[PDB]
Amino acid sequence: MIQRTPKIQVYSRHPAENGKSNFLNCYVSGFHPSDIEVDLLKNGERIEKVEHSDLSFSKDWSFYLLYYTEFTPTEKDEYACRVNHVTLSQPKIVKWDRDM
Template identity: 75%
Template sequence: KRIRLVTMRLGVQSLAKLSPPKVQVYSRHPAENGKPNYLNCYVSGFHPPQIEIDLLKNGEKMNAEQSDLSFSKDWSFYLLVHTEFTPNAVDQYSCRVKHVTLDKPKIVKWDRDH
Protein backbone atom coordinates (compact mmCIF):
# COMPACT_ATOMS: atom_id res chain seq x y z
CA LYS A 1 0.00 0.00 0.00
CA ARG A 2 2.80 2.40 0.85
CA ILE A 3 4.44 1.98 -2.59
CA ARG A 4 1.12 2.63 -4.37
CA LEU A 5 0.56 5.82 -2.37
CA VAL A 6 4.01 7.18 -3.25
CA THR A 7 3.47 6.35 -6.94
CA MET A 8 0.08 8.06 -6.89
CA ARG A 9 1.53 11.19 -5.30
CA LEU A 10 4.35 11.35 -7.83
CA GLY A 11 1.88 10.86 -10.68
CA VAL A 12 -0.32 13.71 -9.48
CA GLN A 13 2.68 16.00 -8.96
CA SER A 14 3.97 15.35 -12.47
CA LEU A 15 0.55 16.01 -14.04
CA ALA A 16 0.06 19.36 -12.32
CA LYS A 17 1.57 22.46 -13.85
CA LEU A 18 3.20 25.36 -12.07
CA SER A 19 0.50 27.76 -10.91
CA PRO A 20 1.07 31.11 -9.19
CA PRO A 21 -0.90 31.89 -6.02
CA LYS A 22 -3.94 34.17 -5.91
CA VAL A 23 -3.93 36.29 -2.74
CA GLN A 24 -6.90 37.86 -0.93
CA VAL A 25 -6.55 39.90 2.29
CA TYR A 26 -9.67 40.74 4.29
CA SER A 27 -10.98 41.21 7.83
CA ARG A 28 -13.61 38.89 9.30
CA HIS A 29 -15.84 41.82 10.32
CA PRO A 30 -16.14 45.36 8.92
CA ALA A 31 -13.19 47.38 10.23
CA GLU A 32 -13.75 49.76 13.14
CA ASN A 33 -10.81 51.60 14.72
CA GLY A 34 -10.06 50.27 18.20
CA LYS A 35 -12.36 47.24 17.85
CA PRO A 36 -10.69 43.77 17.88
CA ASN A 37 -11.09 41.82 14.63
CA TYR A 38 -9.43 39.03 12.64
CA LEU A 39 -7.16 39.57 9.64
CA ASN A 40 -7.22 36.82 6.98
CA CYS A 41 -4.94 36.05 4.06
CA TYR A 42 -6.47 33.45 1.74
CA VAL A 43 -4.00 32.07 -0.80
CA SER A 44 -5.32 29.75 -3.51
CA GLY A 45 -4.71 28.16 -6.89
CA PHE A 46 -1.01 27.48 -6.39
CA HIS A 47 1.20 24.52 -7.30
CA PRO A 48 3.60 23.11 -6.13
CA PRO A 49 2.42 23.12 -2.49
CA GLN A 50 5.60 24.58 -0.96
CA ILE A 51 4.77 28.17 -0.01
CA GLU A 52 5.59 30.81 2.61
CA ILE A 53 2.82 33.16 3.79
CA ASP A 54 3.22 35.98 6.33
CA LEU A 55 0.83 38.60 7.65
CA LEU A 56 2.61 41.93 8.13
CA LYS A 57 1.95 44.96 10.33
CA ASN A 58 3.86 47.99 9.03
CA GLY A 59 6.17 45.58 7.16
CA GLU A 60 6.95 43.43 10.24
CA LYS A 61 5.90 39.77 10.47
CA MET A 62 2.97 39.10 12.82
CA ASN A 63 2.29 35.94 14.80
CA ALA A 64 -0.41 34.10 12.88
CA GLU A 65 -2.08 30.72 12.58
CA GLN A 66 -2.22 28.71 9.37
CA SER A 67 -4.86 26.22 8.24
CA ASP A 68 -3.93 22.77 7.00
CA LEU A 69 -2.85 22.63 3.37
CA SER A 70 -5.82 21.62 1.19
CA PHE A 71 -6.26 21.01 -2.52
CA SER A 72 -8.97 21.70 -5.08
CA LYS A 73 -10.39 19.44 -7.83
CA ASP A 74 -7.72 20.72 -10.24
CA TRP A 75 -4.96 19.68 -7.76
CA SER A 76 -4.03 23.28 -6.99
CA PHE A 77 -3.59 24.11 -3.31
CA TYR A 78 -5.04 26.65 -0.89
CA LEU A 79 -4.30 27.93 2.62
CA LEU A 80 -5.72 30.43 5.08
CA VAL A 81 -3.43 32.41 7.40
CA HIS A 82 -5.16 34.47 10.09
CA THR A 83 -4.54 36.45 13.27
CA GLU A 84 -6.32 38.70 15.73
CA PHE A 85 -5.71 42.42 15.24
CA THR A 86 -7.16 45.77 16.24
CA PRO A 87 -7.33 48.20 13.31
CA ASN A 88 -6.54 51.88 13.77
CA ALA A 89 -5.98 54.91 11.55
CA VAL A 90 -2.17 54.52 11.46
CA ASP A 91 -1.06 50.90 11.05
CA GLN A 92 -0.79 49.27 7.61
CA TYR A 93 -1.50 45.54 7.20
CA SER A 94 -0.57 43.24 4.32
CA CYS A 95 0.10 39.65 3.33
CA ARG A 96 3.44 38.54 1.85
CA VAL A 97 3.61 35.35 -0.23
CA LYS A 98 6.76 33.59 -1.44
CA HIS A 99 6.37 30.83 -4.05
CA VAL A 100 8.55 29.24 -6.75
CA THR A 101 6.33 30.76 -9.49
CA LEU A 102 7.00 34.32 -8.28
CA ASP A 103 10.15 36.28 -9.19
CA LYS A 104 9.84 38.24 -5.95
CA PRO A 105 7.52 38.03 -2.92
CA LYS A 106 3.95 39.11 -3.67
CA ILE A 107 2.65 41.68 -1.18
CA VAL A 108 -1.08 42.44 -1.05
CA LYS A 109 -2.25 45.28 1.21
CA TRP A 110 -5.37 45.03 3.34
CA ASP A 111 -7.95 47.52 2.12
CA ARG A 112 -10.21 48.28 5.09
CA ASP A 113 -13.00 49.44 2.78
CA HIS A 114 -13.35 46.12 0.88
Protein backbone atom coordinates in the same frame (compact mmCIF):
# COMPACT_ATOMS: atom_id res chain seq x y z
CA MET B 1 5.09 19.01 -13.81
CA ILE B 2 2.62 21.89 -13.31
CA GLN B 3 3.18 25.25 -11.59
CA ARG B 4 0.28 27.52 -10.66
CA THR B 5 0.82 30.94 -9.15
CA PRO B 6 -1.13 31.86 -5.99
CA LYS B 7 -4.18 34.09 -5.98
CA ILE B 8 -3.94 36.19 -2.80
CA GLN B 9 -6.70 38.00 -0.86
CA VAL B 10 -6.14 40.07 2.29
CA TYR B 11 -9.23 40.93 4.32
CA SER B 12 -10.82 40.95 7.74
CA ARG B 13 -13.10 38.34 9.17
CA HIS B 14 -15.76 40.90 10.22
CA PRO B 15 -16.25 44.37 8.76
CA ALA B 16 -13.40 46.45 10.22
CA GLU B 17 -14.02 49.04 12.92
CA ASN B 18 -11.07 50.85 14.46
CA GLY B 19 -10.67 49.91 18.10
CA LYS B 20 -12.58 46.63 17.78
CA SER B 21 -10.87 43.20 17.94
CA ASN B 22 -11.13 41.23 14.66
CA PHE B 23 -9.06 38.80 12.61
CA LEU B 24 -6.89 39.68 9.60
CA ASN B 25 -6.84 37.00 6.89
CA CYS B 26 -4.52 36.22 4.02
CA TYR B 27 -6.11 33.59 1.81
CA VAL B 28 -3.78 32.04 -0.76
CA SER B 29 -5.34 29.72 -3.32
CA GLY B 30 -4.93 28.12 -6.70
CA PHE B 31 -1.25 27.34 -6.26
CA HIS B 32 1.01 24.37 -7.03
CA PRO B 33 3.36 23.03 -5.77
CA SER B 34 2.48 23.35 -2.11
CA ASP B 35 5.72 24.91 -0.79
CA ILE B 36 4.79 28.55 -0.10
CA GLU B 37 5.93 31.27 2.33
CA VAL B 38 3.19 33.43 3.81
CA ASP B 39 3.72 36.22 6.34
CA LEU B 40 1.35 38.85 7.64
CA LEU B 41 2.99 42.26 8.17
CA LYS B 42 2.05 45.20 10.39
CA ASN B 43 3.66 48.43 9.27
CA GLY B 44 6.15 46.29 7.38
CA GLU B 45 7.20 44.03 10.27
CA ARG B 46 6.23 40.37 10.41
CA ILE B 47 3.57 39.34 12.90
CA GLU B 48 4.60 36.27 14.86
CA LYS B 49 1.23 35.15 16.19
CA VAL B 50 -0.31 33.94 12.92
CA GLU B 51 -2.17 30.66 12.56
CA HIS B 52 -2.89 28.77 9.38
CA SER B 53 -5.32 26.16 8.08
CA ASP B 54 -4.43 22.56 7.20
CA LEU B 55 -3.27 22.27 3.60
CA SER B 56 -6.09 21.22 1.32
CA PHE B 57 -6.86 21.45 -2.39
CA SER B 58 -9.54 22.18 -4.92
CA LYS B 59 -11.09 20.11 -7.67
CA ASP B 60 -8.27 21.06 -10.07
CA TRP B 61 -5.71 19.84 -7.48
CA SER B 62 -4.58 23.38 -6.72
CA PHE B 63 -3.83 24.15 -3.07
CA TYR B 64 -5.33 26.71 -0.72
CA LEU B 65 -4.43 27.94 2.75
CA LEU B 66 -5.76 30.54 5.08
CA TYR B 67 -3.37 32.44 7.34
CA TYR B 68 -4.91 34.56 10.04
CA THR B 69 -4.15 36.60 13.10
CA GLU B 70 -6.21 38.33 15.80
CA PHE B 71 -5.82 42.11 15.62
CA THR B 72 -7.48 45.41 16.50
CA PRO B 73 -7.42 47.72 13.50
CA THR B 74 -6.47 51.37 13.98
CA GLU B 75 -6.39 54.35 11.69
CA LYS B 76 -2.58 54.40 11.49
CA ASP B 77 -1.69 50.70 11.23
CA GLU B 78 -1.04 49.41 7.71
CA TYR B 79 -1.28 45.66 7.13
CA ALA B 80 -0.18 43.39 4.32
CA CYS B 81 0.47 39.80 3.34
CA ARG B 82 3.85 38.73 1.94
CA VAL B 83 3.84 35.64 -0.22
CA ASN B 84 6.71 33.81 -1.87
CA HIS B 85 6.37 30.84 -4.23
CA VAL B 86 8.38 29.20 -6.97
CA THR B 87 6.14 30.91 -9.52
CA LEU B 88 7.05 34.41 -8.38
CA SER B 89 10.14 36.22 -9.69
CA GLN B 90 10.09 38.14 -6.40
CA PRO B 91 7.89 37.97 -3.26
CA LYS B 92 4.46 39.54 -3.67
CA ILE B 93 3.28 41.97 -0.98
CA VAL B 94 -0.46 42.55 -0.98
CA LYS B 95 -1.80 45.35 1.19
CA TRP B 96 -4.99 45.10 3.12
CA ASP B 97 -7.30 47.46 1.16
CA ARG B 98 -9.83 48.68 3.72
CA ASP B 99 -11.85 50.64 1.14
CA MET B 100 -13.60 48.18 -1.21
